[PDB]
Amino acid sequence: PDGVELENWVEPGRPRTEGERMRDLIAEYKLFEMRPRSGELEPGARCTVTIE
Amino acid sequence: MREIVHIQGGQCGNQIGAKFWEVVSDEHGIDPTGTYHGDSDLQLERINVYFNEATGGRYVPRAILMDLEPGTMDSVRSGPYGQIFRPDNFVFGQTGAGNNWAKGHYTEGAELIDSVLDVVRKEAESCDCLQGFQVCHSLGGGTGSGMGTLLISKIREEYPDRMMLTFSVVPSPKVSDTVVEPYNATLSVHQLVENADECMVLDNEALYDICFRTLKLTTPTFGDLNHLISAVMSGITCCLRFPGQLNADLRKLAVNLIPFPRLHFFMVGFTPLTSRGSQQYRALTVPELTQQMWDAKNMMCAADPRHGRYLTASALFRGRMSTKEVDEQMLNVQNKNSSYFVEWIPNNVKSSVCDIPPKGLKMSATFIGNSTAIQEMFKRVSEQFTAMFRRKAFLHWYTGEGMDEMEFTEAESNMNDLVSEYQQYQDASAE
Amino acid sequence: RRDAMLGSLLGDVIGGLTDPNSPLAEAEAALSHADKVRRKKKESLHNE
Amino acid sequence: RKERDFHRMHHKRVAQEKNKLLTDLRRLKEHYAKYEPTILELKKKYETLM
Amino acid sequence: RKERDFHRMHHKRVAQEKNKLLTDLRRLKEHYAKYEPTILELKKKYETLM
Amino acid sequence: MREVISIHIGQAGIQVGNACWELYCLEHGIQPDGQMPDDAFNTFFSETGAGKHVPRCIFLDLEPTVVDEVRTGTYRQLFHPEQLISGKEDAANNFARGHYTIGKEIVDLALDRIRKLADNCTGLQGFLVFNAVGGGTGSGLGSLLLERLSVDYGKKSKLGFTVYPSPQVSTAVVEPYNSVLSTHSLLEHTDVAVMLDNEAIYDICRRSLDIERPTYTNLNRLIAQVISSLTASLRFDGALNVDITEFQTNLVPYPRIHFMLSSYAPIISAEKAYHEQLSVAEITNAAFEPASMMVKCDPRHGKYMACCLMYRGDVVPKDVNASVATIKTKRTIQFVDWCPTGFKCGINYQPPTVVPGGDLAKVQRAVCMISNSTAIGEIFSRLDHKFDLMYAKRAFVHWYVGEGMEEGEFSEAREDLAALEKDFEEVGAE
Amino acid sequence: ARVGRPLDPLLAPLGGGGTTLSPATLGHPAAAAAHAQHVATLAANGVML
Ligand SMILES: Nc1nc2c(ncn2[C@@H]2O[C@H](COP(=O)(O)OP(=O)(O)OP(=O)(O)O)[C@@H](O)[C@H]2O)c(=O)[nH]1
Ligand SMILES: Nc1nc2c(ncn2[C@@H]2O[C@H](COP(=O)(O)OP(=O)(O)O)[C@@H](O)[C@H]2O)c(=O)[nH]1
């Protein structure tokens, strides 16, 4: 998601392509997740991003 | 030869259907015993649309009366036209639903729905050609709205291509009869959007306003409202039953009316509705009838057309008239009120003319308007449902009927989505 | 000829009933995915 | 906002048409799964008669 | 702008899914049409073998 | 020996056929029962051994009411019962419904009866297809039948007397849609297509018949008079006999450009009759008046390409030549540079018969002008915007898709009417 | 007699027309195939016209 509000809009359908279905199961079961997402930093700051 | 199967559901639906059958039989010259007494060939020419011939000359209406409590059917049978209906078409339970849509859709409707569909299939298979089914009932009630949505879903599953016409009495804006009206309305609208191909919104307070301001009646009982609704329900299909200069069946009306599938809710009004005092003072002309037609007060639905935008509008006229006259009148209306009309549809008029006007009236006309104004009615029902669902008041009676709480969110989401398409096609710009 | 065409049609029908790659298989995959999506949206909307 | 509304309504009515196609597919599947057991029974009778 | 880009992409995706579903529905109609002659053929073979 | 097979499709087609057959029966003296108290009827009727003359017509419709009106009306013993073909479910203003799902069996039975009718004709001048562009039955079933006739009968000249939607006034909502679709269909099948607009005929009735109260019966009566004037040379002899085959060769410059304005003169009530001379010159000028057409299309925007005049009654060739020479010397009338002659005069000695109960007066002279002009592209230009305005949101597209139509069909139809616009532009241009 | 134009520059892509009485040869097979394939590509890509 790109910060967009979904309101009774169907999820992406059956991809029928293996790469896209891998991406979609990743999305469904939260396999890869980065916590901070967007950030902003002053010069020399430290963000401490986490990817799990 | 294109048959229609009528179903009357709930107390309000059963009363409206009984009034409708009284009106139709009187129009076709049928006495309450079923024998023809009209002395007119055209009346019997297409009598098969609503009636079947019995062993003798008796004509049995193709009506199915449905209820959970026997009192409404006892009153209907004791009424003036209660003996025309076949007794096997009276499908009633023993315990009524206490204004519980969950009771009328899950617990008590499940047992009776088998008999209901059995009677429906028996009535439909006898028909040579089936235009479809018309179900008359009221939103905001347990038994009626509940099994009405259930039966509409079942008949949609059985006959996907056949026409579905629904006449739902939406709960009134200002004065509400039962507390659980917004729950029932929200649950029923969810089913009607998905299943009913063509659906009508009617409001009791709009009925009172029109009968008090136009008809100028003093003591309007529910019988008068049922009479007006019956007149509209006859005029919607008089083209099927009588020869017309420019005929239009239910499917033609649906095609010319529904721009997008989910926006199939329509409002009606009937012309000429004249007070007894000013009947002599009025003039029966197409410009008069159209001016009354396009008035907000003539609309049988609470929402006023001025707030919204007319997506489409069909007008089924009845009587000996000029198709030139009618087309000029409605084109002039569109040009004059082009602000209220959607721009990306060059013509918002579906005009049909029938050669047989109703009895007593030299000319008449029914109006079916698909306008974005009904957005405000859906919004008001949402403003009630959301407020009372925020505290889950009387949610628990429905929770007891084996239906999930998530279904209320489902219905609200679908209803407000429909609100969204109404608003956006109201404010949609060409190109 | 009748035996050959009967066998061909019987094989086609039985394969459609039970094949890993059959039009019924794609139909059920699509409809099951649609049902799962609807259930997930509705439960998620209720939770939200 | 105008562009967003345009692309919105396009996406929504395409999705509605997809859902209708899904419903029609369900109806056809039921209508012919009604037929299939007769084929199965006739196959069984065929085998027994051989 | 984010909403319009989002809805453009999903409109395209659902249109592609609709086309795929249309092709699948055509194939399914073909297979369903293949069903009904099989009953008659099996009945004729049943009678002849009997 | 000069038989012409009549087909009437949809409500408008059947309702104009009612007037057409009333007019032909009155013209040849054929009573409603079927028989009349030489061989001038053979073009429209086939006589049986009993003396009863049955029309060589076919009433095709998917709606039963219109055909049942004929089966019940005064003309129940005249028409052949199987010739009246009735459907079960109406096309519901859906071209896909009338062309893909409902219309198949109906058109098959229609061609069965059409073959039976054509076997009974020694010669066959052609077909007269009367349908309603702007409705599923007329559009879809009419298009399917026209394709079917073009494929099987082949070189028989088919005259399609189509009614297109008026510019501003209309009665249907998907009327631009199905009109574009049926024009897409009939651009390649009909040999000569006659354009009609309800608004224009309404204006004619309002202004010249002084009918403030126009209706479909009057419109259909006027159309029937136009067609009877068109066919008068097949049934009645006269100087400058013009044939059905001669129409297209004298009227169609290029294969696609075969749509035709039709104009009758005079259109005057019995009251206003015998207040004017109604000479040949005056009636010809009235016919060439921009206002007098049965289509809402001003010639002054375009240029005339061909004009075939059919005169009926006491008309002399010097008078027709003098009137047409004055028309040519008139500055308002403008022809294309590449057609110096552009005039096909034909006369007949049979004055137009008047239907009792009608408004048209008994005039000893009549002119039917059928003209190919580049102006007519304007009406197609109107529909080409009416179509794409809705097609931007693709409203009502789901209805057409449901009965086996694809978005490609709509796109191709729009492309085709754009191509027709370009054809009219290039025929107009030098 | 069947007549075709062998010297017409514009009719050369078709090959003189004529009758081409075989069903696969009827009309404009190449043009129809190209147009249908292009429409199919647009529909499969979801590029609405
Ligand atoms: N001139 C003229 N036009 C008519 C008349 N009756 C109907 N029309 C036109 O015919 C159009 C539609 O014709 P049809 O397709 O035959 O209508 P239908 O018989 O109900 O068939 P569908 O609408 O396709 O279901 C309408 O838009 C009218 O404008 C008539 O009597 N005279
Ligand atoms: N027009 C009309 N409306 C009615 C009548 N009886 C009840 N209603 C309305 O219908 C609404 C719903 O009631 P209903 O569904 O019939 O109750 P239920 O049968 O127990 O489900 C109520 O708000 C009433 O105002 C009647 O006879 N005529």
What does the DSSP assignment read for F278-317?
Answer: --HHHHHHHHHSTTSSSSS--GGGS-EEEEEEEEEES--H
Evaluate the CA torsion angle E4, E6, E7, E11 in order and state its sign: positive
Tokens of F115: 């073959």
| Tokens standing for residue A4 | 């967009």
The amino acid at B239? C
- Beta pairing partners, F192: F159
Q: Give how far the C-alpha of residue F37 lies from the chain's centroid of Cα atoms, to the nearest Å.
A: 31
With tokens 């001038």, the residue in question is F40
Q: Do B287 and B357 touch, CB atoms closer than 8 A?
A: no
Instruction: Collect all residues with Cβ–Cβ distance below 8 Å to F178 and sequence separation of at least 6.
Output: F93, F94, F95, F133, F134, F135, F136, F139, F140, F172
**CB B133 within 8 Å of CB B87:** no
* Structure-block tokens of residue D23: 């419903």
Using an 8 Å Cβ cutoff, are E32 and D24 in contact? no
Cα gap F209→B83, rounded to integer Å: 54
In whole angstroms, what is the distance from residue E6 CA to residue B198 CA? 33
- Residue in B227, B161, B224 with CA at minimum distance from that of residue B19: B227
Structure-token pair, residue B168: 């739902």
Beta strands in F80-138 (DSSP E): 84-86, 126-130
Beta bridge partners of B130: B3
Active site (annotated) includes residue F276: no
* CA neighbours closer than 13 Å in the CB half-sphere of residue B161: 9
Residue F261, SS3?
Answer: strand
Whether residue B73 contacts residue B117, with contact meaning beta carbons closer than 8 Å, is answered with no
In chain C, whose CA is at the least distance from the CA of D25?
C27
What is d(CA F274, CA F237) in angstroms, rounded to the nearest whole number? 27
Question: Mapping DSSP to helix (H, G, I), strand (E, B) and coil, where does residue B202 land?
Answer: strand
Q: What span, in angstroms and rounded, lies between the C-alpha atoms of F405 and F25?
A: 41
Query: How far, CA to CA in Å, does B50 sit from each of B24, B404, D34, F92?
Result: 8, 39, 32, 20
- Using the beta-carbon criterion (under 8 Å), do E41 and C6 form an inter-chain contact? yes
Distance CA F295, CA F373 (A): 12
CA distance to B7, B65, B68, B134, E12, per residue, from B10 (Å)? 10, 9, 8, 14, 45
DSSP B44-109: HHTGGGTEEE-SSS-EEE-EEEEESSHHHHHHHHHSTT-SSS-GGGEEE-SS--SS-HHIIIIIHH
| Contact yes or no for B328/F169 (Cβ under 8 A) | yes
E42 interfaces chain D, CB cutoff of 8 Å: yes
- F330: CB partners within 8 A, 6+ apart: F288
Would you say F81 and F63 are in contact if contact means Cβ atoms under 8 Å apart?
Answer: no
Whole-Å CA distances, F371 to F61, F262, F265, F323, F418: 30, 7, 14, 16, 22
Whether chains A and C touch (3+ CB pairs under 8 A) is answered by: yes
Which residue's structure tokens are 């017409």?
G8
Q: What ranges make up the beta strands (E) of F165-266?
A: 192-197, 259-265
How is residue F375 annotated by DSSP? G
Helix axes of B406-426 and B181-194: crossing angle, nearest 10 degrees? 70
Gap between the terminal Cα atoms of chain E: 74
Q: What Å distances lie between residue E9 and A10, E12, E17, CA to CA?
A: 13, 5, 12
B409 is in an annotated binding site: no
Q: What is the 3-state secondary structure (H, E, C) of A1-46?
A: CCCCCCCCCCCCCCCCCHHHHHHHHHHHCCCCCECCCCCCCCCCCC
Is the torsion defined by CA of E38, E39, E41, E42 positive or negative?
positive
Contact residues on chain A for D12, CB-CB shorter than 8 A: 9
CA angle, B233 then B358 then B206, to 5°: 45
Instruction: Tell whether ligand 1 has an atom less than 6 A from the beta carbon of residue F12.
Output: yes
3-state secondary structure of F337: coil
Of E14, E42, E45, the CB nearest to D15: E14
Cβ atoms of F179 and B342 closer than 8 Å: no
Ligand 1 and F103: CB distance under 6 A: no
* CA separation for the pair B392, C46 (Å, rounded): 13
Q: How many residues does chain A have?
A: 52
Which residue in this structure is represented by tokens 């009524």? B96
Give the H or E element holding residue E20.
helix E2-49
CB atoms within 10 A of CB B401: 18
Taking CA atoms, F19 is separated from F15, F16, F66, F221, in Å, by 7, 5, 14, 5
Indicate which residue's Cα is closest to atom 9 of ligand 2.
B12
Contacts of G34 (CB under 8 A, 6+ apart): none
User: What's the gap between Cα B217 and its chain centre?
Assistant: 23
* E strand map for F328-385: 343-348, 365-373
The DSSP symbol for F340 reads S
Method: cryo-EM
Nearest chain C alpha carbon to D18: C34
Contacts B428 to D, Cβ<8 Å:
5, 9
How far is the C-alpha of B125 from the C-alpha of D39, rounded, in Å?
26
Helix (H, G, I), strand (E, B), or coil: what is residue B226?
helix
* Tokens read off for B11: 């107390």
User: How far apart (Å, rounded) are the C-alpha atoms in residues B390 and B29?
Assistant: 53
Which alpha helices (H) appear in B294-364, and where do they start and end? 323-336
The answer to whether A14 touches C28, Cβ cutoff 8 Å, is: no
Kindly state whether B382 is in contact with chain A, defined as any CB-CB distance less than 8 angstroms: no
Measured at the CA of F254, the angle between CA F252 and CA F260, to 5 degrees, comes to: 40
Whether residues G43 and F411 touch (CB distance < 8 A) is answered with no
Question: Is residue F358 helix, strand or coil?
Answer: coil
- Among the bound ligands, name the one nearest to the CA of residue B350: 1
What would the 3-class secondary structure string for D1-50 be? CHHHHHHHHHHHHHHHHHHHHHHHHHHHHHHHHCCHHHHHHHHHHHHHHC
- 3-class SS at F234? helix
Per the CB < 8 A criterion, the answer to whether B274 and B213 are in contact is no
Would you state the structure tokens that stand for residue C14, as one six-digit string?
A: 């039985």
Closest by CA to F185, choosing from F297, F118, F103, is: F103
Distance CA B415, CA B395 (A): 18
What is the number of CB-based contacts under 8 A between chain A and chain C? Answer: 13
Distance CA F231, CA F4 (A): 9
**CA nearest neighbour of B142 among B201, B218, B66, B205:** B66
Q: Distance (Å, rounded) from C-alpha B212 to C-alpha B298?
A: 11
Ligand 2 centroid to B220 CA: how many Å?
Answer: 15
* Residues E19/E25/E31/E37 CA torsion (nearest 10 deg): -130
What letter does residue F75 receive in the DSSP assignment? T
Identity of the residue in C2, C13, C27 whose CB atom sits nearest the CB atom of E38? C13
B210 Cβ contact partners less than 8 Å away, ≥ 6 residues apart: B228, B269, B273, B297, B298, B299, B300
Place of tokens 């909403």: E3
How would you classify the pairing of strands F157-164 and F126-130? parallel
Cα(B216)–Cα(F417) distance, integer angstroms:
54
Q: By three-state DSSP, how is residue E24 classified?
A: helix
The DSSP call for residue F376 is: G
> Which has the closest alpha carbon to B52: B164, B114, B130?
B130
Distances (CA, A) of B124 to B3, B49, B52, B129, F27: 9, 12, 11, 9, 49
State the best of E5, E8, E12, E17 to mutate against chain A, taking most chain A CBs within 10 Å: E17
- Name the token pair of E38: 């099989």
Taking the CA atoms of residue C18, residue C20, residue C26 and residue C30 in that order, the dihedral angle to the nearest 10 degrees is 100
A9, with CB counted inside 10 A (0-12, 13-18, 19+), is: middle
CB B229 within 8 A of CB B20: yes
Residue indicated by tokens 């896909």:
F96
Residues 6+ apart with CB under 8 A from B18: B8, B76, B79, B81, B82, B226
Ramachandran area for residue F427 (φ above 0: left; ψ -120 to 50: alpha; else beta): alpha
SS (H, E, C) G1-49: CCCCCCCCCCCCCCCCCCCCCCHHHCCCHHHHHHHHHHHHHHHHHCCCC
- Show the DSSP H helices in B214-260 as ranges: 222-235, 238-241, 250-257
Q: Is the dihedral of CA F119, F124, F126, F129 positive or negative?
A: negative
DSSP H or E stretch at residue E39: helix E2-49
Indicate if ligand 1 lies below 6 Å from the C-beta of F131.
no
Nearest to F295 by CA among F135, F176, F161: F161
Query: Cα separation of F11 and F93, whole Å?
Result: 11
**DSSP H or E run through E11:** helix E2-49
DSSP 8-state code for residue F271: T
Dihedrals phi, psi of F123, to nearest 5 degrees: -95, 175
How many angstroms away from the CA of B326 is the closest CA of chain D? 34
Closest CA to B98 of B7, B9, B185, B180: B180
Phi, psi for residue F318 in degrees, rounded to 5: -65, -40
- Ligand showing the shortest atom-to-Cα distance for residue F223: 1
- Shortest distance between the Cα of C24 and any Cα of chain B, in A, equals 20
Q: How many other C-beta atoms can be found within 10 angstroms of the C-beta atom of residue F382?
A: 19
User: Which amino acid is present at F46?
Assistant: S
**CA nearest to F305, candidates F337, F346, F263:** F337
B108 is written with which tokens? 């008590």
- CA-to-CA dists, residue B55 to A33, B35, B58, B127, F430, angstroms: 75, 12, 7, 16, 77
Residue B26 main-chain phi, psi, to 5 deg? -65, -40
Which positions ≥6 away from F300 have C-beta within 8 Å? F290, F332, F375
Contact yes or no for F137/F62 (Cβ under 8 A): yes
Burial of G3 (0-12, 13-18, 19+ CB in 10 A): exposed
Q: How many residues does chain E have?
A: 50
How far does CA B119 lie from the centroid of its chain? Answer: 22
> What is the enclosing helix (H) or strand (E) of B311?
strand B310-318
DSSP H or E stretch at residue F426:
helix F407-428
* Structure token digits, residue B278: 């000013």
In the block, which residue shows the tokens 């069947």? G2
Residues from chain B contacting residue F205 (CB–CB below 8 Å): 324
Give the closest residue to F397 by CA, choosing from B160, B249, B255.
Answer: B255
B203: left (phi over 0), alpha (psi -120 to 50) or beta: beta
Q: Which of F17, F14, F36 is nearest to F26 (CA)?
A: F36
Amino acid identity at F338: W
Find, among B117, F162, G25, B385, the residue nearest to B109 by Cα.
Answer: B117
DSSP output for B7-58: EEEHHHHHHHHHHHHHHHHHHTTB-TTS-B----HHHHHTGGGTEEE-SSS-
CA distance B374 to B300: 12
Please give the distance of CA B177 from its chain centroid, rounded to a whole number: 20
Residues in chain G: 49
Cβ-based neighbours of F106, under 8 Å, separated by 6 or more: F60, F62, F85, F87, F141
C-alpha span between F159 and B294 (Å, rounded): 42
- Indicate the resolution in Å: 3.5
Cα distance from N-terminal residue to C-terminal residue, chain F: 43
- Tell me the chain B residues in contact with residue C38 when contact means C-beta distances shorter than 8 Å: none
- Cβ separation E5–A2 shorter than 8 A: yes
Q: Which amino acid is at B373?
A: A
Hey, which of B147, B169, B300, B301 would you mutate to test ligand 2's pocket, going by the most ligand atoms within 8 Å of its Cβ? B169
Q: Using an 8 Å Cβ cutoff, are D29 and D21 in contact?
A: no
Q: How far is CA D44 from the centre of its chain?
A: 28
Distance in angstroms (rounded) separating the CA atoms of residues F171 and B322: 13
What whole-number distance in Å separates Cα of residue G48 and Cα of residue F120? 51
Decide if B297 contacts B271 (C-beta within 8 A): no
Please, are residues F234 and F4 in contact by the beta-carbon 8 Å criterion?
Answer: yes
Q: What is the CA radius of gyration of chain A?
A: 15
What letter does residue B339 receive in the DSSP assignment? G
The 8-class DSSP code of residue C45 comes to H
Please name which ligand lies nearest the alpha carbon of B324: 1
